[PDB]
Symmetry: D2
């Protein structure tokens, strides 16, 4: 079915001037952009956005990185969007993405495990939480 | 348990200059205001906000009224907030509110069934949907 | 002439549960509320908002205080709003406000010079800058 | 000097899937994106945004077009940004842009005079007004 999912272009990709190319990729893959904005997570907000990872070892590093500069979020809509977007971005380790998924966003724009260019919702459950975390219904147009 | 619910101060109450008194009431009742903003529904957004009522006979009138001028929404937080807030606002017919719940917001500020001063989420399910419709997680502070 | 000015209800007044009463005062004084929202200044944004004071001795305390909790901003519109609102809020030292302007907002709700309940734009120039700092044209309704 | 200017990607360009490529162009030209969002002008807001054109013959058509669908606004920052961005987008008639400025945004993505892909601020004065119209200081990051 037609689904919505959330992506966030991370500060590493922002700084590399990859934003336009990344959005273009999703457009070329056939997704409609239903919401879009640049903003900055406070550490507290990044922490809440990533609450499911609180007890993971990478958590503090992730929260700091995701609040270290401006990011851009977008709601993408399309057939089977959650699964397809997940596949389009590729493995979370950018270097591994270059090895096993060379045409993935992370392969193309990611640097390593932490600076891996982009975030996308993992599941229907997380897409619902993440989309509402960033965008109200008023912002989806 | 501690809950969150949504209220919307409608254009009739806005025009009566009731906004301050209405917020004050919820503050005196012990709720924390977690989000607040003045905005204007487009007819399309009002219709989406009230989608559960789309097949009801009052729908078009409701949509038109709720898009006829600026409104103010707030997220209220407190123990059993969803049902307590319903009770504080009173019966949806303002005249009936004066008869059976004379201390209610609708008895005090409402005119009739259409101009009834204020909206509040009806259930936990509707609260979840309505809060996200108006406010993102980024707007809850 | 009809003018617009900005007020911000500070964390001390928020915590005292004064928000509703303060908005009500401006409503009773005859102002139209043209924009309204609860948000939280980051330290950096508070500093930018108060940039004219950057070299003043109270700056760091002001920036820290105004970023220590959520605040509520409003755009108020009316004849001579800028000076009338200044007069309604009273002297910046709340204790002095009680001595020389006992009916002022700061006399009623303010504690001292730092916790003084409320901010209002100082001049037409600062009003223009402050309104744009907090609200876009899209948020004025 | 370093300046800020506003662009808006219009509904024609949005529908052609040009958003990513258009932002990429500005990134490659060396501009920093300081604010970004998708939204929809109401006809009233489009009319206020374009107030300087109220008495022009194209006004109603422009207002209707610019409120006919979602658009994306961005604040661009860079050396001499206002003049450079104005030149990058090219003549307002897209067909003429193809004739005299073939590498311009309007030549590349514009259709005709009305559907001409993009808007950019014309002057320092209009840039200031247009930026504040769309984005608050809180949204510039």
């Amino acid at each position: 079915a037609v689904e919505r999912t959330l992506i966030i272009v991370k500060p590493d990709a922002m700084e590399k001037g990859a934003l336009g190319k990344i959005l273009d990729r999703f457009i070329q893959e056939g997704f409609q952009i239903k919401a879009l904005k640049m903003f900055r997570f406070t550490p507290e907000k990044a922490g809440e956005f990533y609450y499911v990872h609180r007890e993971r070892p990478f958590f503090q590093e992730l929260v700091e990185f995701m609040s270290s500069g401006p990011v851009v979020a977008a709601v993408l809509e399309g057939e089977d969007a959650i699964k397809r977007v997940r596949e389009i971005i590729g493995p979370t380790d950018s270097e591994e993405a270059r090895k096993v998924a060379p045409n993935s966003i992370r392969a193309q724009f990611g640097t390593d495990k932490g600076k891996n260019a982009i975030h996308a919702s993992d599941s229907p459950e997380s897409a619902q939480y993440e989309i509402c975390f960033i965008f109200s219904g008023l912002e989806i147009v």
